[PDB]
């Protein structure tokens, strides 16, 4: 039916209108104070007033930190940009890691622009170029102008073109009898397809046949666009989208990450501010999530202390599972959660507590009904006892081998014997480690 | 074809109740691991869940990769099976996370439904209109069958495919409209005046009868990585073969995920997940493990199968020793299959099957002595001795391997243990760890 | 005979559903309660608008990248459309840097140093280094000894464009590799040859996996021309920038000449073919669909984007095959217009609310659109299904044959609790 992967039984924080966390709501069991703190953080992000606010989710393994991150993402909605990231992703062989971090920082910022578009469209009726006086003169083109006649519903318009537009028109491979669509903002032409006013069944080029477009040939339409600031920076650093030669050859070169300068980002900020001041654009700040932040070294942390102090920085959520560990890139500095103390002073730490037997049992209950499986009560008690004895995750994954072993005996219900058979067939970390210690040749 | 290490394994050897036979499909013994692998096989065949980590652990020469090829052979066609080693991730143009992302996306198959039209008949007239420089091409094709006749219109790709493998007004061609393929089936007109610049001896086929144009539904499976590489830049289809896919941006991947879900919503496509098999998984850095721990939690995640032959040893990138060479976070979200050593009857059955695969006839006493030396030494040595003993017996001009042939093969070619023994009495002849060697014999 | 039909939400419908859920800041319980009771009515109006069809909340339009441009726009027997796209970012440069660093004048030595470095002290000059040129011509096989001076002082793209495969003499040190020998044989070779098929892996992989009928999945978000550099008070800067941005040789190379202009140049003017400017050097796209970043709205996505409309499209085929007369009920008129244009796309015989006896007398009309005596109806359909019995009872009252009602419902929304 549908596919599930270690999540998707979580639909939100499950708070009230007063911010009080109910015990079993939103797919969440327990973690009440952490859910309330994350709800206050969600309201702070919705307030749209602060920049560079950082929190850290600190706890042990299998305690609900990534679940809280996706819960915050689902509470904020699809409008707010959310950028998930693992700490190993910053090490690029193309560009330095500082630029990758700043690229993600700009990617966690949204922008909603209402843009107007000038559109010429219709079915091509005539296509007649006029020649130049001296074609082999070295300077100048072979043609001077091209006359294109477009017709539509209640309209017929005759267009005189420069050579630069007609190069794009012929790059789209138009013909007489074609419905085209010309963008006046960038000179782009889209060839929609053949018109249905002629015969259809006499082609061999798998084409699609469109009716005559409605309205006048010349139009002005309003389009709502959703971009990020990284898109503006990338589109300006490697220019495409013009009909000039440098943008024309920028599409053919192999793309590569470059070090975007501060001057380009300042100019992009100036253009976005001028858009906002005219009542056209709207700024939607978002969240950057860095899971496994202990994989960062001291240089990325030291750049984080400078990148957090900008006046455009997003809200960055960090996660760790470290006790009193040495920071990577150092030899003697030992810090809580693997994060240096110059950054910890700028964070707000949120604790995340372990579970009890009843919480483990009901987590197995929701994971069973989301995976579309039916479990007996005694098998559920045995699974909860395994989850306390070995791990919650091991009891969570053993559900689907139990379902396969139940289906292979022409049955639907999961019984205790299936759980014992899945105990025997599949092992956990502790049993495998005990086999490893008592072994002949490094098993 | 040629004979490889696992050429004798075609399947997993299981019943309808997922119970292993003692000898089936080239696999002997290892009952519990084969039953667990059959459970993983049914888990893949259901296609319901995503991102499960399976670890296969045991001593060397036990049947780890044998189990992996059994799963791959029982998986069937059109389901992806990506097999990588631990050392292929380290690249000079790709980061480790990018290489692992591409290895994850190679294991998810997208099966696309496509409506095509087929045209077969006799060519009556070809008119081709070209420009003076030869760039713009257009024309008409006049094709006929017994009952029908239709003048078509051609474009540049059709004239390019018509000029290649030249058709000459009386040949019978078959046109695929969606794949754009022109296939010449033969010639039926038998034209009298042939200006023979060529040595064509084309087949005499009949003129086809019936409908000229016929619809057909086709299916083809493509991978998620291939769609990403095609959509990344202008010439990405070349980069599917040259490997010039340098760090595909994340925006391409989000748009491809949304479009694949959209194609599922119209019934045009469907998602067929597969198995990614990472052999020698201890040869991965700690950053790769930290990436895998969160890459297993995505909607588009395959079933990851890992094989390890190592004990409590040092994790790469760190300074501590962990079980199986893997950190405890990765071991938390994995289910472990344990594989055990062999008896002597299993070794004998393995050697008999490997002799039958190489088409080499063995005597009884040769089989017992090969079994004894595969018990005392390793099994792979006694499997390697079979072809050498066959060539020795073929030197004497008889097609059966005796005890003398395998005895000569044991004398000529050495084991590991005899090599350690011979090196340790003659340490002066070989170069030591400190660079000292005596080369003079006196 | 009451039949209820359930359909799951689509991806876009779930997207605006989650947007509407996150907009009002987690008060869904009161929303559902006072939606079931029937300000908040304007809040739930958007919810039923999304649940009906996603085009009521936001109409789908042409999908194109954002144009980061300032161009010549209109503020409203032919018309002129001239290319005028620019970049909003301006880089301002003083005149002094240009006139004293890039342009030659009497007080600077740009052209003197250029001549000294590029002509006089060039080591491929045959006027001073004839022996090196003769050595290189024995090495390479070039028939001219001035080829190396020409190659070393021209740009790379110009060298790609005017490169001609001229003949070279045999008595030289240059060779033919076996890879090049394999390449040259299969240039025009037909199918079913062994060498030709062993050298054509990529085209066979293209034609086997049906790659000329695949759809484009990614388009860029922002498209932006190069950054415009302005210098106030200088025509030379404008001419230099226009020459660099619109170089006629490379612009002709990435395009082609029209066929009638080639006929006029070859025949009416006597220009030989070898004297034509080199054209047609742009790479071919993968498909027709991969040639541009603009995607038009299609009338196949319009059906699938609404689960109710998709289920009704599947349900209408069986009633068309069984030849009934179907009544469709609504609550608004925007959905009435949307279903009217959908039916005209499908070309079904339908009438829209002197029409009553026209409906009874003519059996050719299939779908009647009504808004909350028609005895000729056989099947009545509730699109916007509401369980008020006062409206439902009279709707079944205005409807000898078997009468079946249909209700289109969406799983996991307000209507499922309704």
């Amino acid at each position: 039916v549908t596919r599930t992967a270690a999540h998707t039984h979580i639909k939100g924080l499950g708070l009230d209108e007063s911010g009080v966390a109910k015990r079993v709501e939103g797919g969440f069991v327990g973690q009440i104070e952490a859910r309330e703190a994350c709800g206050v953080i969600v309201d702070l992000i919705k307030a749209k007033k602060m920049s560079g606010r950082a929190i850290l989710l600190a706890g042990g393994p299998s305690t609900g930190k990534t679940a809280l991150a996706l819960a915050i993402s689902q509470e904020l909605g699809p409008k707010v940009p959310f950028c998930p990231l693992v700490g190993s992703e910053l090490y690029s062989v193309e560009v330095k890691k500082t630029e990758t971090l700043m690229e993600n920082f700009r990617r966690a910022i949204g922008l909603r622009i209402k843009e107007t578009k000038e559109v010429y469209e219709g079915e091509v009726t005539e296509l007649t170029p006029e020649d130049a006086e001296n074609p082999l003169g070295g300077y100048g083109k072979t043609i001077s102008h091209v006359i294109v006649g477009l017709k539509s519903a209640k309209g017929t318009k005759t267009l005189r073109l420069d050579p630069t537009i007609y190069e794009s028109i012929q790059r789209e491979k138009v013909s007489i009898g074609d419905v085209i669509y010309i963008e006046a903002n960038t000179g782009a032409v889209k060839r929609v397809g053949r018109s249905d006013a002629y015969a259809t069944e006499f082609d061999l080029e798998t084409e699609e046949y469109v009716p005559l477009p409605k309205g006048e040939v010349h139009k002005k339409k309003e389009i709502v666009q959703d971009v990020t600031l990284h898109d503006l920076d990338v589109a300006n650093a490697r220019p495409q989208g013009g009909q000039d030669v440098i943008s024309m050859m920028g599409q053919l070169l192999k793309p590569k990450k470059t070090e975007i300068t501060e001057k380009l980002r300042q100019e992009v900020n100036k253009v976005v501010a001028k858009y906002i001041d005219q009542g056209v654009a709207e700024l939607i700040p978002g969240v950057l999530f860095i899971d496994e932040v202990n994989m960062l070294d001291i240089e990325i942390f030291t750049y984080l202390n400078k990148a957090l102090e900008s006046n455009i920085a997003p809200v960055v959520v960090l996660a760790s599972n470290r006790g009193m560990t040495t920071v990577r890139g150092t030899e003697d500095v030992i810090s809580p959660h693997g994060v240096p103390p110059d950054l910890i002073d700028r964070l707000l730490i949120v604790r995340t507590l372990p579970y009890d037997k009843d919480e483990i049992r009901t987590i197995i209950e929701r994971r069973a009904t989301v995976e579309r499986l039916q479990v007996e009560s005694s098998a559920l008690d045995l699974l909860a006892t395994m989850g306390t004895e070995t791990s919650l995750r091991y009891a969570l994954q053993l559900l689907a081998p139990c379902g396969i072993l139940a289906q292979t005996s022409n049955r639907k219900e999961i019984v205790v014997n299936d759980v014992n058979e899945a105990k025997l067939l599949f092992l956990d970390a502790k049993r495998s480690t005990k086999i490893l210690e008592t072994s002949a040749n490094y098993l | 074809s040629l004979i490889a290490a696992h050429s004798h394994i075609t399947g997993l050897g299981l019943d309808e109740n997922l119970q292993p036979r003692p000898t089936s499909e080239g696999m002997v013994g290892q009952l519990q691991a084969r039953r667990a692998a059959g459970v993983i096989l049914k888990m893949v065949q259901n296609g319901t869940i995503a991102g499960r980590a399976v670890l296969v652990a045991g001593p060397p020469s036990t049947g780890k990769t044998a189990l992996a090829m059994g799963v791959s052979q029982s998986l069937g066609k059109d389901v992806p099976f990506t097999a990588i080693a631990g050392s292929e991730i380290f690249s000079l143009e790709l980061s480790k996370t990018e290489a692992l992302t591409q290895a994850f996306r190679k294991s998810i198959g997208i099966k696309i439904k496509e409506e095509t039209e087929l045209i077969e008949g006799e060519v009556v007239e070809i008119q081709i209109d070209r420009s003076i420089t030869g760039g713009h091409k257009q024309g008409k094709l006049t094709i006929k069958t017994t009952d029908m006749e239709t003048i078509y219109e051609l474009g540049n790709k059709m004239i390019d495919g018509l000029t290649k493998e030249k058709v000459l007004a009386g040949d019978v061609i078959s046109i695929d409209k969606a794949s754009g393929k022109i296939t010449k089936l033969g010639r039926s007109f038998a034209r009298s005046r042939d200006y023979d610049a060529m040595g064509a001896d084309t087949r005499f086929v009949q003129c086809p009868e019936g409908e000229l144009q016929k619809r057909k539904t086709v299916v083809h499976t493509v991978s998620l990585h291939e769609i990403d590489v095609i959509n990344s830049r202008t010439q990405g289809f070349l980069a599917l073969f040259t490997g010039d896919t340098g760090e595909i941006r994340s925006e391409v991947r989000d748009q491809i995920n949304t479009k694949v879900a959209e194609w599922k919503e119209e019934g045009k496509a469907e998602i067929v997940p597969g198995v990614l098999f990472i052999d020698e998984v201890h040869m991965l850095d700690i950053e790769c493990f930290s990436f895998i721990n969160r890459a297993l939690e995505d909607e588009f995640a395959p079933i990851v199968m890992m094989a390890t032959n190592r004990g409590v040893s040092k994790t790469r990138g760190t300074n501590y020793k962990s079980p199986h060479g893997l950190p405890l976070d990765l071991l938390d979200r994995s289910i472990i299959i344990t594989t055990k050593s062999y008896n002597e009857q299993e070794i004998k059955t393995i050697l008999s099957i490997r002799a039958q695969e190489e088409e080499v006839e063995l005597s009884s006493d040769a089989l017992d002595l090969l079994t004894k030396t595969g018990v005392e030494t390793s099994l792979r040595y006694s499997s390697n001795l079979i072809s050498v003993a066959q060539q020795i017996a073929m030197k004497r001009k008889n097609n059966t391997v005796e005890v003398e042939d395998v005895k000569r093969a044991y004398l000529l070619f050495l084991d590991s243990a005899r090599s350690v023994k011979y090196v340790q009495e003659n340490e002066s002849q070989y170069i030591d760890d400190q660079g000292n060697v005596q080369i003079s014999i006196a | 005979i009451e039949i209820d039909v359930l359909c799951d939400l689509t991806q876009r419908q779930a997207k605006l559903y989650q947007v509407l859920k996150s907009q009002i800041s987690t008060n869904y319980d009161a929303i559902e309660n006072a939606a079931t009771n029937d300000n908040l009515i304007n809040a739930v109006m958007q919810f039923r608008k999304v649940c009906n069809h996603p085009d009521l909340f936001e109409r789908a339009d042409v999908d194109s990248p954002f144009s980061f441009t300032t161009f010549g726009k209109t503020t409203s027997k032919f018309t002129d459309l001239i290319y005028s796209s620019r970049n909003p970012i301006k880089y301002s440069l003083p005149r002094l840097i240009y006139e004293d660093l890039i342009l030659p004048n009497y007080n600077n030595d740009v052209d003197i140093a250029n001549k000294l470095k590029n002509v006089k002290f060039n080591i491929f000059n045959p006027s001073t280094n004839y022996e090196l040129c003769l050595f290189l011509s024995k090495l390479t096989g070039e028939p001219s000894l001035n080829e190396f001076f020409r190659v070393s002082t021209t740009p790379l793209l110009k060298r790609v464009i005017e490169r001609t495969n001229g003949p070279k003499n045999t008595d030289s040190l240059s060779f033919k590799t076996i890879t090049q020998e394999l390449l040259e044989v299969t240039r025009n070779a037909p199918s079913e040859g062994v060498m030709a098929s062993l050298l054509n892996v990529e085209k066979h992989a293209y034609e086997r996996e049906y790659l000329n009928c695949i759809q484009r999945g990614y388009h860029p978000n922002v498209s932006a021309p190069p950054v415009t550099i302005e210098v106030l008070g200088s025509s030379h800067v404008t001419n230099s920038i226009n020459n660099e941005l619109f170089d006629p040789l490379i612009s002709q190379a990435l395009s082609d000449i029209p066929a009638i202009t080639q006929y006029n140049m070859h025949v009416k003017k006597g220009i030989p073919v070898e004297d034509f400017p080199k054209t047609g050097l742009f790479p071919e796209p993968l498909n027709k669909n991969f040639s541009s970043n603009i995607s038009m709205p299609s009338m196949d996505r319009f059906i699938t984007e609404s689960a109710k409309l998709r289920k009704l499209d599947e349900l209408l085929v069986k009633l068309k095959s069984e030849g009934h007369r179907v009544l469709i009920y609504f609550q608004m008129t925007k959905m009435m217009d949307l279903m009217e244009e959908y039916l005209t796309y499908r070309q079904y015989n339908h009438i829209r609310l002197d029409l009553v006896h026209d409906w009874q007398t003519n059996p050719e009309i299939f779908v009647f659109l009504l808004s909350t005596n028609l005895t000729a109806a056989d099947t009545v359909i509730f699109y916007d299904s509401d369980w008020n019995p006062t409206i439902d009872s009279q709707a079944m009252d205005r409807a000898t044959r078997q009468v079946t009602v249909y209700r289109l419902l969406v799983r996991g929304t307000i209507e499922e609790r309704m």
Binding site: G177, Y198 | D129, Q138 | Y263
Partner: peptide
Amino acid sequence: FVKPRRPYNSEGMTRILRRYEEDLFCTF
């Protein structure tokens, strides 16, 4: 009724004709 076929325009272009008995090649 039957829709008209699309107009065909080949002006200033060479032609290659291939028939049963004879092949032509019209050049400029």
